[PDB]
Amino acid sequence: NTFEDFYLKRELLMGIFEAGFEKPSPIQEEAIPVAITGRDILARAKNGTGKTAAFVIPTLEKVKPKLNKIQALIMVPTRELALQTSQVVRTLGKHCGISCMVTTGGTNLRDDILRLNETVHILVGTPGRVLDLASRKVADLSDCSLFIMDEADKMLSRDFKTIIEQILSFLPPTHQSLLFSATFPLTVDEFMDKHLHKPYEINLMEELTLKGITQYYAFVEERQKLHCLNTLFSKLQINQAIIFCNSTNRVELLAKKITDLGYSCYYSHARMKQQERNKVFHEFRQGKVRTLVCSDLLTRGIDIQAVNVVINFDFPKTAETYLHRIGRSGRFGHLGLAINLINWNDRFNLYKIEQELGTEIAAIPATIDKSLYVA
């Protein structure tokens, strides 16, 4: 209901109040209580200040200002994320009397080793730098009872995972772990069973991965859209493709326009019959027509191979929708291509979504490598 219902320090609640949060978003309602009891957490949820606070709030609750040692280590892959995180930390922990230091690859080692001479309670840093300072004995983690990984999936890749495990060596044998991620698959479970203890798993997203899928956006005016789509049909090697629109009307009109140009295609949407929907679905899976235009695919069937190109004719408003449209279910690196058509009023939704799902939607290049949407 409210943050006050979580029985937190006065100063922490003050911090939240000044920060302007009124009611806890669901990730906070789920994680904040479980975290403040000591239990480990493995959560999947979209990125945001909401989630960052969903773990920063417990951190500020646990750490004792009176003890001048590192009591919480917050690992992040990129420096900008260390910045944003530490910013949320300083904000919410405004009245808590708690020092938060950032230590990354972009910074100077000398200034960081110098900074660590003074009191630091919550350390926020990237794998390399943190392991460096840890090995150096510059950063004392003997009383660091709390370990956190935001965008954890980015740091459990082949190389980083080693560094993470080497950092974890310094932490006390008995320590709390909080692992957060946007994108579903986890590289290893040996890591999990070894380094986590009775973790309370949270999952607030569909089980879909953008792994292997190369994402591009293209700023295209509303009137210029069809021309652009044709240019893509002409310039891209497609065995089969799916187009997405934000309205049934636009779906039908676009499908009919595509058939009018000279490409055989089917269409589906919610306002269509269920039986007819699944019918067109299977018919498309067969490969009768080389394209489909659809508003919704509530029905989920794993990982259709044939499709190699996905296009958002209309950019979605929310990251859930975008994920449902682009995300494939196969845990393994499903190979695909996604092209988004960016309206003037979608420029923000692109920034937001790109951020929430923790993925990269780069500007569409003239020369798209054929290795990315066919093999």
Binding site: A218, F219, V220, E221, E222, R223, Q224, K225, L226, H227, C228, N230, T231, S234, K235, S247, N249, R250, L253, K257, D260, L261, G262, W344, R347, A363, I364, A366
Partner: peptide, 29 residues
């Protein structure tokens, strides 16, 4: 309702192929 269809009648179907790079500069307005 929809605006594009009048905008891009299928039948003429002719233009110098759409250039993305030029519109990517119009990203800021």
């Amino acid at each position: 309702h929809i605006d594009w269809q009048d905008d891009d009648v299928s039948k003429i179907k002719q233009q110098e192929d759409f250039d993305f790079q030029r519109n990517l500069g119009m990203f800021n307005k």
